[PDB]
Amino acid sequence: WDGKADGTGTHAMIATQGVTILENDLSSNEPEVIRNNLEILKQNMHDLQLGSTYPDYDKNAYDLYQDHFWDPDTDNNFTKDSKWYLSYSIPDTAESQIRKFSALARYEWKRGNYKQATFYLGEAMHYFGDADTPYHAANVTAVDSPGHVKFETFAEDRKDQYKINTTGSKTNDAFYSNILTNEDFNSWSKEFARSFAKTAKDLYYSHANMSCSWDEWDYAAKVALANSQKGTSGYIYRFLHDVSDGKDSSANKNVNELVAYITTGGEKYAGTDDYMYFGIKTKDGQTQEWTMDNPGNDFMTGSQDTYTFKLKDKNLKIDDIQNMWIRKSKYTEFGDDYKPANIKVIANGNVVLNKDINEWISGNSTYNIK
Ligand SMILES: [Zn+2]
Ligand SMILES: [Zn+2]
Ligand SMILES: [Zn+2]
């Protein structure tokens, strides 16, 4: 969907309607705590709005916005994971970004940083909105068809007519109560986003493409935007319960992958063009290392990049991972010095590590973070 850096546009409409919708739909018997947190969320509406549009303006490592797309039919066609996932980081999709920003929002909320947490939740909603945009779910880019920018411009100009203020259900109903059933956020999120994205993808094929009529476009925009609103409300509801209901999710959960959110310093030569690796060592002495590399330019000055690592061993628990590190490798005589500001590691929905660094890394060097 379209959005603007000042926090206005289709994306902000969706996020804003999301809190209005959740408020109308909240059942009268819902615990007081759920309403208190909703209220703090409303106080921070401006950040939710800024977050909901920001990813389209982030100077990142994605030259063609690949992470704003997601095909809901791939992420489980039951084709085995490529062997390269074991030595190289894997790129993000709109679905993986929802999990990433959600984990960052829950973490900041618990630490009491409401503005930053709300901003993060907004970015999570931005990616859900993308997962619910017909052209994004069908992977039809601006290069494949002029229908992409046209449909989005068309939806942007009529955004006010596409607003809704209820999902048609109250929190006591199935739509919302089914959101609390699965204790595991990541798996609930993936299938929740998937049903909405599959619906959006079908709308590309049935009503939104360049071979359809203006009335078909009207129906596609209406359903896709209403769906984007309903799903956003669903996420906010899940969020409020997660940050309110204090349950520790079990440290006995298998760790299939780790995600690192790395912030490079803003000093002049903080960025580097050398090879950068992320690695781990278990209690059992086994180690695994991956090259960090996204489609665009990684580790530039002041950037914030994400890297996903698939573990070779799928029966490990977070506690089995004894050490974690990043490592720089040069090809020239002295190489390119790197100064990371902060690194966060996420596992199964929780940020298990948050380390400020602000120290230079030189030559071929290994810097331990855990
Ligand atoms: Zn968008
Ligand atoms: Zn688009
Ligand atoms: Zn986007």
Curated annotation (Swiss-Prot):
Protein name: Phospholipase C
Gene that encodes the chain: plc
Top-level taxonomic group: Bacteria
A GO term, aspect molecular function: zinc ion binding
Amino-acid positions noted as binding Zn(2+) 3 in the UniProt annotation, renumbered to this chain: 56, 68, 126, 130
Function: Bacterial hemolysins are exotoxins that attack blood cell membranes and cause cell rupture. Constitutes an essential virulence factor in gas gangrene. Binds to eukaryotic membranes where it hydrolyzes both phosphatidylcholine and sphingomyelin, causing cell rupture. The diacylglycerol produced can activate both the arachidonic acid pathway, leading to modulation of the inflammatory response cascade and thrombosis, and protein kinase C, leading to activation of eukaryotic phospholipases and further membrane damage.
Chief localization: secreted
Residue stretches spanning the membrane: none
Entry GO terms, CC: extracellular region
Residue ranges of domain Zn-dependent PLC in the record: 1-250
General remark: This bacteria was isolated from a diseased swan.
Cofactor note text: Binds 3 Ca(2+) ions per subunit. Binds 3 Zn(2+) ions per subunit.
Any Pfam family matching the protein: Zn_dep_PLPC
Catalytic activity entry: a 1,2-diacyl-sn-glycero-3-phosphocholine + H2O = phosphocholine + a 1,2-diacyl-sn-glycerol + H(+)
Residues binding Ca(2+) 2: 293-294, 296, 298
SUPFAM superfamilies: Lipase/lipooxygenase domain (PLAT/LH2 domain), Phospholipase C/P1 nuclease
GO BP terms in the entry: killing of cells of another organism
Classification via InterPro entries: PLAT/LH2_dom, PLAT/LH2_dom_sf, PLipase_C/P1_nuclease_dom_sf, PLPC/GPLD1, Zn_PLipaseC
Residues that bind Ca(2+) 3: 272-273, 297-298
Protein keywords: Calcium, Cytolysis, Hemolysis, Hydrolase, Metal-binding, Secreted, Signal, Toxin, Virulence, Zinc
Annotated binding of Ca(2+) 1, by residue: 271, 337
Comment, domains: The protein is composed of 2 domains; the N-terminal domain contains the phospholipase C active site (PLC), in a cleft which is also occupied by the 3 zinc ions. The C-terminal domain is a putative phospholipid-recognition domain, which shows structural homology with phospholipid-binding C2-like domains from a range of eukaryotic proteins. The ability to bind membrane phospholipids in a Ca(2+) dependent manner and toxicity is conferred by this C-terminal domain, which also contributes to the sphingomyelinase activity.
SMART domains given in the database record: Zn_dep_PLPC
Residue ranges of the region described as Linker: 247-255
Domain PLAT: 256-370
